[PDB]
Design a protein around this ligand. Sequence first.
Ligand SMILES: Cc1cccc(CNC(=O)c2cc(C(=O)NCc3cccc(C)c3)ncn2)c1
Ligand SMILES: [Ca+2]
Ligand SMILES: [Ca+2]
Ligand SMILES: [Zn+2]
Ligand SMILES: [Zn+2]
Length: 169
Amino acid sequence: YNVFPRTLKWSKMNLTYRIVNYTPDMTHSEVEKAFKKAFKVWSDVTPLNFTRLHDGIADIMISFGIKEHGDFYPFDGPSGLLAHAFPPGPNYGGDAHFDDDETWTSSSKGYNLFLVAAHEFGHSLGLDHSKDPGALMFPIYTYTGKSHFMLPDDDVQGIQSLYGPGDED
Ligand SMILES: Cc1cccc(CNC(=O)c2cc(C(=O)NCc3cccc(C)c3)ncn2)c1
Ligand SMILES: [Ca+2]
Ligand SMILES: [Ca+2]
Ligand SMILES: [Zn+2]
Ligand SMILES: [Zn+2]
């Protein structure tokens, strides 16, 4: 027999993702690079593997949309909500949605796609919000302006509590 796991998490280390559509704001290459780097943020500190699918059903379906887009969390035009992701689970679980009424960038203007994606994928993997103002999972977008990204310890401790550290070196 089997009882449901203690925490909400993926039961397999091999996860797949699919970029269903693209924002008008960035080139396909820029968007793909941003998401690849965002997934690497988490795979670098766990035993998780992320493989991209170009079609079909992936564990983490990524899409850009506006207003009503297929769930109970409609977006709201420019400003306000910017993105959301569902926790691990069947069907829409793990999916990540980005509000295309927002401005997405690979720089410091508007919302840095990589940064927001890293945050959203945290949710896709089982992390909720943190009270640490400097954590990636803090609820409010707080771009620091640093030239290099380093996953804050609070997030490292959080994701490893769910999946283990994988290779520690
Ligand atoms: C090369 C490079 C690229 C990008 C960023 C950096 C520097 N790092 C940061 O600026 C940073 C920001 C955040 C943060 O703002 N977290 C909260 C949050 C994030 C997204 C979405 C929501 C809703 C809330 N957490 C950790 N680090 C360097
Ligand atoms: Ca919005
Ligand atoms: Ca899914
Ligand atoms: Zn949605
Ligand atoms: Zn969040």
